[PDB]
Design a protein around this ligand. Structure first.
Ligand SMILES: [Mg+2]
Ligand SMILES: [Mg+2]
Ligand SMILES: [Mg+2]
Ligand SMILES: [Mg+2]
Ligand SMILES: [Mg+2]
Ligand SMILES: [Mg+2]
Ligand SMILES: [Mg+2]
Ligand SMILES: [Mg+2]
Ligand SMILES: [Mg+2]
Ligand SMILES: [Mg+2]
Ligand SMILES: [Mg+2]
Ligand SMILES: [Mg+2]
Ligand SMILES: [Mg+2]
Ligand SMILES: [Mg+2]
Ligand SMILES: [Mg+2]
Ligand SMILES: [Mg+2]
Ligand SMILES: [Mg+2]
Ligand SMILES: [Mg+2]
Ligand SMILES: [Mg+2]
Ligand SMILES: [Mg+2]
Lengths: 117, 66, 153, 70
RNA sequence: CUUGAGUCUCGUAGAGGGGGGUAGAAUUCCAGGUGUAGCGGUGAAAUGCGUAGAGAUCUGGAGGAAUACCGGUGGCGAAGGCGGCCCCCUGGACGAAGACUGACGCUCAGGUGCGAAAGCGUGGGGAGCAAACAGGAUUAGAUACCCUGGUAGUCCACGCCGUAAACGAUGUCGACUUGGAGGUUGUGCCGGCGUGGCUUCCGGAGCUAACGCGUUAAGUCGACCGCCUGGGGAGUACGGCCGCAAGGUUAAAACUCAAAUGAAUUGACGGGGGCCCGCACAAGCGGUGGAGCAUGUGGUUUAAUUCGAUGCAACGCGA
């Protein structure tokens, strides 16, 4: 329905998955998509390509808002960081800023124990 | 390299001169390794102390992305 | 091999129309080294198709090859005991090799009376995307596309 | 790290300046070190091993330069 | 008597200790906004969470625990240990040139004090993590490794416990015996020349079974203390002491063996590594395993089914 013309797209790049949430300047979400929600599970869901497809699908999913410019929040270690950005840029969005938003405890809480794989 | 505080013989690094501490903090906000600057050890300790003080007084950010 | 010291081999040009493509194709169709019977079956089939089409033998056969020539196949690859189909590229010569092979086999398992007739109407429907061979081009293409997300190591 | 896609900026080189800022900022470094708990003794062991192998490498290549290979 | 030992004055460095305050990042939980079919997790999965609206993103709030960067074979402490920032109380170390005492010293059985983590008692706290436990897988089984959860505990105060590969597996003090490259912190003379404290690495003589150690000795000496006397039984039993308990400490015997042990050497092996080869993989093409038959084998049968070969490297083998 409504039009914003300016957005901020949040990328949650984990090792298992990649989530692309498009909001507006005040943090109210416009739309989103995920690698797992796009025909990939397990191995492929954790690939740069699935992340890319999720970014373009989320672009399509916010078509009805006329967004042109996007700040970029990349969050997390996963490989889905850059592929999703190039998908959002090639999709026809004018990228303006790129900020890494990964949480860094300045100590913090005890992480889980090492896996003895 | 060339540790500066010994060049000018400063006694204490004085958290107040932020423009001085501006050069020994990363623009993300982090203290820069003494190896990278060539500051001397005693002076790098004074540096860390004064940077954390000026952080407590909110004259320098703890991070780039508060 | 572990060496890569394989030079290329010479292959005879065909008598009827001077096509090494037909010599390769007949070497695929051949069994037990009965080369004369293979070349004869094949010239028969290609003249049957040069009449049921009118284009030419060379050209009806190229039209059957292109419509069946695939451009990307998958390559098995083991990662964590799991076996990954990774879509690799193909050099042109492997493309036409695969085309000719799939075409000969999909003709072999057909149900006409003779074999030259099977290959003739096979290459015809191959040229019209109704044969098992263009179907295998399709299977290899969608196999590459599905696992295309592995277009890297 | 924040990245300004400047005026007239080609998007790919601003992408690469982003890559540089994340790589020299230490972001994947921190996430992969902080993913799991480390015994204090374990990381003392690892830092000591890093430094000793580095100084041993220094002095190895120090004794190397004064020899002819063939 | 003053060099051993110690006192006084100026200075310097440090996560040394005890008590209080305060800050930022982050996790979890709560209230609400947007927003929509997933999320999460794994080698792959499932358990689990989500249309009762999850995850994601935003605003606000509560709470606990640790203090990224600095950060460093950097520092301090008897050892155990000690790390955001600020304040209060407090121990020690070292340096410079003096003034003072006058052997006041070293070591230490018995004794006393301190003493990681786990554990225990009382009373708080509880975010994250996580023995026990529960489920999901894996597996022949899987009381595990992996996943999803999760309680004591981990945090605080007081008291107890007194043990660790509490290690440099190297007792303390003092003296002496070539070097080299560094770190850290004083200080004298003018980036250069001196002299100290602590400290990392290499290495000489020498020592060592060797490995190695080597002015920070495992070199050359002296003082004193602790400890060892083949392996197992056994740091166990009994008794004493200590402890709320868990247990700690002191500490045997019978009996059994001819070894058990250390260092280094040549091989071999490794689900260690590096580099190469081979119809060994891949690529292909044709076979075998199914049927009828030939032949050999095994085994059953027989008086005999002669004897021998019988993983690869015996089985159309001696023939
Ligand atoms: Mg985990
Ligand atoms: Mg005693
Ligand atoms: Mg405790
Ligand atoms: Mg308790
Ligand atoms: Mg668990
Ligand atoms: Mg003991
Ligand atoms: Mg210890
Ligand atoms: Mg130690
Ligand atoms: Mg000992
Ligand atoms: Mg003593
Ligand atoms: Mg040595
Ligand atoms: Mg006992
Ligand atoms: Mg015990
Ligand atoms: Mg060969
Ligand atoms: Mg093969
Ligand atoms: Mg058979
Ligand atoms: Mg015999
Ligand atoms: Mg026989
Ligand atoms: Mg026999
Ligand atoms: Mg044979």
């Amino acid at each position: 329905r409504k039009q914003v013309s300016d957005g901020v797209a949040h990328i949650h790049a984990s090792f298992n998955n990649t989530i692309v949430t498009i909001t507006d300047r005040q943090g109210n979400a416009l739309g989103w998509a995920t690698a797992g929600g796009s025909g990939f599970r397990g191995s492929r869901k954790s690939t740069p390509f699935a992340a890319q497809v999720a970014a373009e699908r989320c672009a399509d999913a916010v078509k009805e808002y006329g967004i042109k410019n996007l700040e970029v929040m990349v969050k997390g270690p996963g490989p889905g960081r850059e592929s999703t950005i190039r998908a959002l840029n090639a999709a026809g969005f004018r990228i303006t800023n790129i900020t890494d938003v990964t949480p860094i405890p300045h100590x913090g809480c005890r992480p889980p124990k090492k896996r003895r794989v | 390299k060339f540790c500066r505080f010994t060049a000018e013989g400063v006694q204490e690094i004085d958290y107040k001169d932020i423009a001085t501490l501006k050069n020994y903090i990363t623009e993300s906000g982090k203290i820069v390794p003494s190896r990278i600057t060539g500051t001397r050890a005693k002076y790098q300790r004074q540096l860390a102390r004064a940077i954390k003080r000026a952080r407590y007084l909110s004259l320098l950010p703890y991070t780039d992305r508060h | 091999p572990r060496r890569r010291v394989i030079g290329q081999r010479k292959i005879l040009p065909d008598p009827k129309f001077g096509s090494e493509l037909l010599a390769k194709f007949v070497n695929i169709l051949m069994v037990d080294g009965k080369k004369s019977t293979a070349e004869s079956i094949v010239y028969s089939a290609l003249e049957t198709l040069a009449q049921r089409s009118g284009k030419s033998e060379l050209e009806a056969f190229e039209v059957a090859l292109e419509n069946v020539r695939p451009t990307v196949e998958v390559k098995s690859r083991r990662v964590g005991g799991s076996t990954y189909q990774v879509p690799v590229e193909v050099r042109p010569v492997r493309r036409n090799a695969l085309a000719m092979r799939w075409i000969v086999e999909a003709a072999r398992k057909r149900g006409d009376k003779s074999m030259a007739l099977r290959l003739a109407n096979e290459l015809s429907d191959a040229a019209e995307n109704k044969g098992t061979a263009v179907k295998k081009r399709e299977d290899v293409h969608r196999m590459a596309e599905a696992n295309k997300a592995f277009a890297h190591y | 790290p924040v990245i300004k896609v400047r005026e007239n900026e080609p998007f790919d080189v601003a992408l690469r300046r982003f890559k540089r800022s994340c790589e020299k900022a230490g972001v994947l470094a921190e996430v992969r070190r902080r993913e799991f708990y480390e015994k204090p003794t374990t990381e003392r062991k690892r830092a000591k091993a890093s430094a000793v192998k580095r100084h041993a490498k220094k002095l190895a290549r120090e004794n190397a330069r004064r020899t002819r290979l063939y």
